[PDB]
Amino acid sequence: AYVCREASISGEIRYPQGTCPTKTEALNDCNKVTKGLIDFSQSHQRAWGIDMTAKVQCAPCKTTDPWDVVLCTCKITAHRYREFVPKIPYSSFSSAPGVIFRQETGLDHDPEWVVNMKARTRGCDHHHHH
């Protein structure tokens, strides 16, 4: 059979000036892109598989500063990613529904799937029992 690998993709989500998301809502937003990616993967021959999980970090809001824009880094990890399938670019899915994160502040390039070459290969299909 084919082996999959772990992969992650990172992006930024910004908030309206003078506002402040709870960590909960930020993770929730981030999980909108999780769902988005699972749907795209799904309709694209499960290139990224369907097992994805999200973590998020935000800057502290400034209670004070009124033109404060809070930046969150959203990071989705795909657990049964097919590195043997051609690499799908951000340009192909940045419009897709749920895909609300964007190029990161300070980064001169787009969000990209990054394969974790240190993690152990795993099945491409999940098996619930045996």
- As a whole number of angstroms, the distance between CA 94 and CA 110 comes to 10
- What is the widest separation between alpha-carbon atoms in the chain? 57
Measured CA to CA, the distance from residue 41 to residue 87 in angstroms comes to 12
The structure tokens listed for 102 are: 């964007």
Q: How many residues does the chain have?
A: 130
Distances (CA, A) of 79 to 16, 18, 42, 105, 121: 32, 36, 14, 26, 10
Number of domains in the chain: 1
CATH at residue 23? 3.30.70.2910
Q: In angstroms, what is the resolution?
A: 2.4
CA dihedral 17, 19, 25, 29 (to 10 degrees): -10
- What distances in angstroms separate CA 62 from CA 29, 65, 72, 117, one per listed residue? 20, 6, 14, 38
Domain that holds residue 9: 1-130
**What SS3 string covers 34-78?**
HHHHHHHHHHCCCCCCCCEEEEEEECCCCCCCCCCCCEEEEEEEE
Instruction: Report the structure determination method.
Output: X-ray
Report strand pairing: 114-115 vs 3-14: antiparallel
Q: Would you tell me how many other CB atoms lie within 10 Å of the CB of residue 54?
A: 18
> Token pair of 87, please?
């690499």
Distance CA 54, CA 28 (A): 9
Dist CA 83 CA 99 (whole Å): 21
